[PDB]
Amino acid sequence: QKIVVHLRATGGAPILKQSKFKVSGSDKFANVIDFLRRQLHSDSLFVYVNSAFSPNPDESVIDLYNNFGFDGKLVVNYACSMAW
Amino acid sequence: QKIVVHLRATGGAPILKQSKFKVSGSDKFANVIDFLRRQLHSDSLFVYVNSAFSPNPDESVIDLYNNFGFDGKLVVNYACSMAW
């Protein structure tokens, strides 16, 4: 099984011309980390994936904004199914 | 203080014409949850925010994709210095 992997630059990191790849699902994530390390010429890159979670209803909006907001706003997603 | 909240529909949920709102930071997140459940007629809507984590080198691409993949792909964010 081949998985489509899209590399997304954040925090002002260099944008790669070739950001879309197809890789074997059995491949270890070390391969992705190593590819980026080589493309950007750095051994200390931040390589991460987003993870969804349902915020505590009792938490204030300002706190969630301070811990998860970006570019002046807090993005709140909503869905029927988490598997699209 | 007012916080801009960007509501985004995913996973089959109905899209709102105006999904951008100003909410008092002092309000509990419960107000956002209740707004969505009320306006979209569903008690079981997933209301989530995105967090982030760096996968371990030995993790397989397939598992990362099955666990956190989005719209037919695994999005890998990278930065030389982090900013949400």
UniProtKB/Swiss-Prot annotation, chains A, B:
GO biological process: autophagosome assembly; autophagy; protein transport
Primary location class: cytoplasm
Tissue expression from the record: Ubiquitous.
Keyword field contains Cytoplasm: yes
Source domain of life: Eukaryota
Any one Gene Ontology cellular component term annotated for this protein: cytoplasm
Compartmental location: Cytoplasm
SUPFAM superfamilies per UniProt: Ubiquitin-like (SSF54236)
A UniProt-annotated Pfam family: APG12
Key words of the record: Acetylation, Autophagy, Cytoplasm, Isopeptide bond, Protein transport, Transport, Ubl conjugation pathway
UniProt xrefs under InterPro entries: Atg12 (IPR007242), Ubiquitin-like_domsf (IPR029071)
Function description: Ubiquitin-like protein involved in cytoplasm to vacuole transport (Cvt) and autophagy vesicles formation. Conjugation with ATG5 through a ubiquitin-like conjugating system involving also ATG7 as an E1-like activating enzyme and ATG10 as an E2-like conjugating enzyme, is essential for its function. ATG12/ATG5 conjugate has an essential role in plant nutrient recycling.
Record-stated family: Belongs to the ATG12 family.
Protein name according to UniProt: Ubiquitin-like protein ATG12B
Originating organism: Arabidopsis thaliana (Mouse-ear cress)
Gene: ATG12B
